[PDB]
Amino acid sequence: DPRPLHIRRQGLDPADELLAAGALTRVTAETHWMATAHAVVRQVMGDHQQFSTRRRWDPELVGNLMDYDPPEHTRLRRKLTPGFTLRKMQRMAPYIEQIVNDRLDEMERAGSPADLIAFVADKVPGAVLCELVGVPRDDRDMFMKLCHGHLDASLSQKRRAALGDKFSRYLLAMIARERKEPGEGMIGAVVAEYGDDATDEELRGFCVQVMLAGDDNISGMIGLGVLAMLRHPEQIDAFRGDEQSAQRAVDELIRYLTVPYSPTPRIAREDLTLAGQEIKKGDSVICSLPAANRDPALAPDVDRLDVTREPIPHVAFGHGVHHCLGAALARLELRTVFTELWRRFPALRLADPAQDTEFRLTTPAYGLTELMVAW
Numbered sequence: 027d028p029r030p031l032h033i034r035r036q037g038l039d040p041a042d043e044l045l046a047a048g049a050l051t052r053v054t055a056e057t058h059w060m061a062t063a064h065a066v067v068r069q070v071m072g073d074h075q076q077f078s079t080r081r082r083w084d085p086e087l088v089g090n091l092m093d094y095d096p097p098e099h100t101r102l103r104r105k106l107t108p109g110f111t112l113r114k115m116q117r118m119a120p121y122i123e124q125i126v127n128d129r130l131d132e133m134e135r136a137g138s139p140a141d142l143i144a145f146v147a148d149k150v151p152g153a154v155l156c157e158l159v160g161v162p163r164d165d166r167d168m169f170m171k172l173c174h175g176h177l178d179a180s181l182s183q184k185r186r187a188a189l190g191d192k193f194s195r196y197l198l199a200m201i202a203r204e205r206k207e208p209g210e211g212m213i214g215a216v217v218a219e220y221g222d223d224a225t226d227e228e229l230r231g232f233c234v235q236v237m238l239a240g241d242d243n244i245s246g247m248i249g250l251g252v253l254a255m256l257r258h259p260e261q262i263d264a265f266r267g268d269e270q271s272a273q274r275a276v277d278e279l280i281r282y283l284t285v286p287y288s289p290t291p292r293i294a295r296e297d298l299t300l301a302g303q304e305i306k307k308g309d310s311v312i313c314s315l316p317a318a319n320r321d322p323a324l325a326p327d328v329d330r331l332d333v334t335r336e337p338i339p340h341v342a343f344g345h346g347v348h349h350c351l352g353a354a355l356a357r358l359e360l361r362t363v364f365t366e367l368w369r370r371f372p373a374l375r376l377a378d379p380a381q382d383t384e385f386r387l388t389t390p391a392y393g394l395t396e397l398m399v400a401w
């Protein structure tokens with residue numbers, strides 16, 4: 027197998043060989059350090075003074091938070107933060123419920139059995155991001171096409187450049203409308219707070235980064251999440267009670283499934299000794315978030331999904347100053363999807379108990395390509 031250890035999974039778990047990798051070891055044509063222990067990953071990601079983020083990494087946008095470190099990163103994140111406050115996330119909840127129920131309506135109309143990934147997992151995330159950004163409902167299909175299209179390598183140059191011209195024109199008019207009268211969306215929140223200090227280029231950059239950062243991780247979580255819950259049916263009761271129970275179940279699913287294989291690679295800013303290893307200035311460190319969230323020190327049963335467990339402080343959203351800017355949105359979106367899904371389809375089940383599981387192996391986030399369910 028040519029695939030790097032950190033990208034290997036076995037079912038819903040990290041592959042056995044990744045789970046047996048030491049806390050911090052060398053892996054290889056580039057050679058890097060691979061961190062698998064929870065405390066080592068926390069040390070690497072939390073210490074931005076010794077470990078900077080590799081720039082222009084792909085699992086160049088202006089104001090792409092992942093490219094900078096404090097203080098430059100701190101100023102940029104500060105500027106974007108207004109679009110992600112907890113009070114603003116609370117106000118999104120009804121909109122997110124409506125998006126989810128509109129997709130569950132299309133699935134319901136198609137009839138049992140149906141593919142949950144095509145109807146729900148692959149559609150809800152981008153619609154929630156459009157809602158967050160401030161894109162008008164009737165423009166969302168077009169917006170998703172323009173945004174991903176201007177970055178689609180499989181297209182012809184002519185096609186990709188035309189989509190990019192349209193995307194720019196669309197974004198700039200949206201930005202001008204928000205500056206004139208700020209709305210409740212992300213752009214409006216940034217310009218309401220910082221006005222002209224937030225440049226059009228920064229805003230365009232913030233928009234693209236967010237569209238890219240909150241899509242695959244969420245669709246992977248919706249698909250894998252439903253599959254995990256169906257495999258542990260008694261635990262579905264956590265989505266049939268109070269909000270706190272549902273929130274704890276979402277956090278547990280996020281930890282147990284850890285869809286991102288790794289955060290941005292980190293570069294040693296100088297020589298240092300970590301976990302008994304000699305790290306030299308310039309060395310690259312890849313953090314296996316899935317392995318770190320299965321660290322035996324975290325719990326005797328860290329390898330089991332248990333939505334009622336004493337919560338385990340996981341690294342699936344990262345750690346330190348770059349900790350996922352959309353984490354609260356993600357938790358809310360996921361809780362909404364699962365709560366509404368089981369409210370609508372109480373008898374949800376795999377369409378065929380013996381059906382194969384179709385894993386999504388081509389994306390930076392683990393997930394499913396299809397999931398046939400009955401109800």
Ligand code: HEM
Pocket residue numbers: 071079091092103158235236239240241243244247280285286288289290291341342343344345347348349350351352353355356
């Ligand atoms: C369950 C889903 C999600 C997971 C597991 C996830 C995971 C992560 C991780 C691991 C990082 C840190 C990367 C690093 O330190 O190198 C990160 C950063 C980030 N995430 Fe997420 N994310 C999710 C959903 C979202 C959503 C929905 C949004 C957008 C609304 C989002 C926006 C971002 C942004 C902008 C950053 C960069 C923050 C910074 O560099 O300061 N994420 N995410």
